[PDB]
Every structure is written in structure tokens, then in C-alpha cells.
Write an enzyme that holds these catalytic residues in place. Structure first.
Site, PDB file in Angstrom:
ATOM      1  N   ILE A  15       0.863  -1.220   0.000  1.00 19.13           N
ATOM      2  CA  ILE A  15       0.000   0.000   0.000  1.00 19.13           C
ATOM      3  C   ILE A  15       0.882   1.247   0.000  1.00 19.13           C
ATOM      4  O   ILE A  15       0.437   2.308  -0.462  1.00 19.13           O
ATOM      5  CB  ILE A  15      -0.873   0.033   1.260  1.00 19.13           C
ATOM      6  CG1 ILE A  15      -1.793  -1.183   1.379  1.00 19.13           C
ATOM      7  CG2 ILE A  15      -1.631   1.340   1.286  1.00 19.13           C
ATOM      8  CD1 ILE A  15      -2.534  -1.243   2.688  1.00 19.13           C
ATOM      9  N   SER A  21      11.236   1.887   3.830  1.00 19.40           N
ATOM     10  CA  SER A  21       9.961   1.499   4.492  1.00 19.40           C
ATOM     11  C   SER A  21       8.905   0.982   3.505  1.00 19.40           C
ATOM     12  O   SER A  21       8.971   1.272   2.286  1.00 19.40           O
ATOM     13  CB  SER A  21       9.406   2.648   5.285  1.00 19.40           C
ATOM     14  OG  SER A  21       8.901   3.640   4.412  1.00 19.40           O
ATOM     15  N   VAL A  23       4.358  -0.070   3.703  1.00 15.23           N
ATOM     16  CA  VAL A  23       3.073  -0.287   4.430  1.00 15.23           C
ATOM     17  C   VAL A  23       2.392  -1.468   3.744  1.00 15.23           C
ATOM     18  O   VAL A  23       2.356  -1.501   2.514  1.00 15.23           O
ATOM     19  CB  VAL A  23       2.139   0.944   4.447  1.00 15.23           C
ATOM     20  CG1 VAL A  23       1.065   0.801   5.516  1.00 15.23           C
ATOM     21  CG2 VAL A  23       2.870   2.275   4.602  1.00 15.23           C
ATOM     22  N   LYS A  37       3.373  -1.066   9.067  1.00 18.01           N
ATOM     23  CA  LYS A  37       4.464  -0.269   8.480  1.00 18.01           C
ATOM     24  C   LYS A  37       5.775  -0.922   8.881  1.00 18.01           C
ATOM     25  O   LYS A  37       5.945  -1.157  10.073  1.00 18.01           O
ATOM     26  CB  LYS A  37       4.436   1.183   8.941  1.00 18.01           C
ATOM     27  CG  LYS A  37       5.364   2.017   8.086  1.00 18.01           C
ATOM     28  CD  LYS A  37       5.691   3.375   8.592  1.00 18.01           C
ATOM     29  CE  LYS A  37       6.866   3.898   7.790  1.00 18.01           C
ATOM     30  NZ  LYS A  37       6.658   5.277   7.295  1.00 18.01           N
ATOM     31  N   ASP A 131       4.806  20.810   8.722  1.00 17.02           N
ATOM     32  CA  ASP A 131       4.743  20.492   7.274  1.00 17.02           C
ATOM     33  C   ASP A 131       3.446  19.730   7.054  1.00 17.02           C
ATOM     34  O   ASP A 131       3.514  18.541   6.815  1.00 17.02           O
ATOM     35  CB  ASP A 131       5.962  19.697   6.810  1.00 17.02           C
ATOM     36  CG  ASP A 131       5.799  19.023   5.458  1.00 17.02           C
ATOM     37  OD1 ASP A 131       5.525  17.817   5.438  1.00 17.02           O
ATOM     38  OD2 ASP A 131       5.982  19.699   4.439  1.00 17.02           O
TER      39      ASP A 131
END
Ligand SMILES: COc1cc(S(C)(=O)=O)ccc1Nc1nc2ccc(-c3ccc(NC(=O)[C@H](C)c4ccc(F)cc4)cc3)cn2n1
Ligand SMILES: [Cl-]
Length: 252
Positions: A15, A21, A23, A37, A131
Site C-alpha cells: 500500500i 519502508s 506499508v 508499516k 509540514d
């Protein structure tokens, strides 16, 4: 399959895909869906490591507080990796903003109420995200949710003015960014989406004699929120506490 705290999760699919990394959509022992994750620490310097530890610590902590922060059921951390097992989304916001051409108004407002609750609760723990962008929120049973805190570590439309004169971070910064999102969510685009030449798009954000354009529309309240959210002087910008008491989120 993935193992976190001696528990097996059958991967259903990728995903998300960062550099270090992933997910995963995932079925547990009783075949309930979850997002996991993965982060790979093999190459991670000591600050990047502290940034992860902090984001996780704080995400861990704000479980109690607000259903508008992404639920986190469990996690494992090791010198080699991190797994975080979390409630699973339908879709991020950046995704859902691109496709949608026409948005029901009682649902834009519901989402705005959701962004305010989320950002309100991180402000209450001394977190300024610094952010904010639609990527940072996730739809989950039609409810909008914040998934990160801007602590751990290529659009530029959401950047607030005070950010550009870093070159001191007050929660006002977040209000601007929530603004920019709400603007897109009503005028189908961000404020400075037209100005493609980036050196000048920066100059537009800081310029007071430059005027952001708010087309007259049916919900005057909504028009008022956006103007109040997008005031260049952050001390004149509207506070999250103020926005929570504004007619727009209050009048039914
Ligand atoms: C079908 O499901 C879908 C589909 C589609 S898509 C392809 O349709 O757009 C899109 C989405 C879903 N679902 C989904 N569910 C969840 C649950 C949780 C998260 C999630 C939660 C927390 C984070 N945190 C971080 O990234 C931060 C930066 C971090 C945290 C810890 C570190 F050590 C280092 C960095 C990041 C992501 C994401 N999704 N995404
Ligand atoms: Cl679980």
C-alpha cells in the site's frame, strides 16, 4: 507473512513504499484486516533513529486522546527494523482529492472538523507538525485521521509564509497549511497552484500586496474561515481554539 511480537500477519498487498519502508495490508490470526508499516534501520544514522523513537513515542502516547489520530495496536523496535501494527485505511487524502471533482459540502466540513480535532490534540502536547499536507491524513470508516507528527524524517503549496523566512515555530504554521487544504477542498486547487515557476511561487506566498483570490460562494462562513486561516501575519491568523468555535464548524 510478517512476525511482530510472535504474531503472524498474512500480507494481502503493498500500500505504501518509502525508500527504507513499506506499508502492508494484512490479515491477522482471526483474519481481521490491519496496516503494518515496516522501516529498515540497517542504514539509519543516530538522529534519524531518535526521530523514529520520538514520532513513535508520541503516536503511542496520543492513543487515549483522539480517535482522529491513527490507532496503533502494537509495535516492535530492534536495531535492524521497526514494525507498527495499525488500524487499516481506505485511502489517503492526496489520492481522494485528485480523483474527486465534486465534493458534497456536509462531508468537506465533517473532514475539516476532523483535521481541527487532530491538529488541536498535537498542539496540546507541544507538537507543531510544521509540514502539514493531505498525504499526512487518511480516511478510515469515512472519518479523516492524522497518521504522523512531522517528527520522523514533493509539493510546496501548503508551506506557510513564516517557514520561508527561516532562511521559532508557532502552532499558527499548521493553521495556514490546514487553510491551504480547505481552499483546495472548495476551489478544487491550492492558492498558488497556477504559479508554476517555483522561485516566484515562494515570492507570492510572502508578498502582502499580492492578494489570494476568494471567489464569492454560498457558504460565507467557509469563505471567512479560509481568509482567516490564510492571513500572512501569523499573530493575526486564527487559532485552532478560535476555528473550533467559528460558525462554520458550529452552525447546523
Ligand atoms: C487499502 O488501504 C490503503 C490504500 C491506499 S491507496 C494505494 O489506495 O492510495 C492508501 C492507504 C491505505 N491504507 C492505510 N492504512 C494505513 C494505516 C497506517 C498508515 C500509516 C501510519 C503511520 C505512518 N507513519 C509514518 O510514516 C512516519 C513518517 C514514521 C513513523 C515511524 C517511523 F519509525 C518512521 C516514520 C505512516 C502510515 C498508513 N495507512 N495506509
Ligand atoms: Cl492486533
Amino acid at each position: 507473512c510478517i512476525s511482530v511480537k510472535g504474531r503472524i500477519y498474512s500480507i494481502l498487498k503493498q500500500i505504501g513504499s518509502g525508500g527504507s519502508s513499506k506499508v502492508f495490508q494484512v490479515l491477522n490470526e482471526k483474519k481481521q484486516i490491519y496496516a503494518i508499516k515496516y522501516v529498515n534501520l540497517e542504514e539509519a544514522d543516530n538522529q534519524t533513529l531518535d526521530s523514529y523513537r520520538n514520532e513513535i513515542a508520541y503516536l503511542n502516547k496520543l492513543q487515549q486522546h483522539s480517535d482522529k489520530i491513527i490507532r496503533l495496536y502494537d509495535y516492535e523496535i530492534t536495531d535492524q527494523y521497526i514494525y507498527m501494527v495499525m488500524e487499516c485505511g481506505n485511502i489517503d487524502l492526496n489520492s481522494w482529492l485528485k480523483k474527486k471533482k465534486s465534493i458534497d459540502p456536509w462531508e468537506r466540513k465533517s473532514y475539516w472538523k476532523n483535521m481541527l480535532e487532530a491538529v488541536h490534540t498535537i498542539h496540546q502536547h507541544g507538537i507543531v507538525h510544521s509540514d502539514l499536507k493531505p498525504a499526512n491524513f487518511l480516511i478510515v470508516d469515512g472519518m479523516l485521521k492524522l497518521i504522523d507528527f512531522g517528527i520522523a524524517n514533493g509539493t510546496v503549496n501548503y508551506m506557510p509564509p513564516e517557514a520561508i523566512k527561516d532562511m521559532k515555530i508557532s502552532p499558527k504554521s499548521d493553521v495556514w497549511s490546514l487553510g491551504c487544504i480547505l481552499y483546495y477542498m472548495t476551489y478544487g486547487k491550492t492558492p498558488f497552484q497556477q504559479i508554476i515557476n517555483q522561485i516566484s511561487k515562494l515570492h507570492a506566498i510572502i508578498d502582502p500586496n499580492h492578494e489570494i483570490e476568494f471567489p464569492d460562494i454560498p457558504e460565507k462562513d467557509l469563505q471567512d474561515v479560509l481568509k482567516c486561516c490564510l492571513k500572512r501575519d501569523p499573530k493575526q491568523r486564527i487559532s485552532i481554539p478560535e476555528l473550533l468555535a467559528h460558525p462554520y464548524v458550529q452552525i447546523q
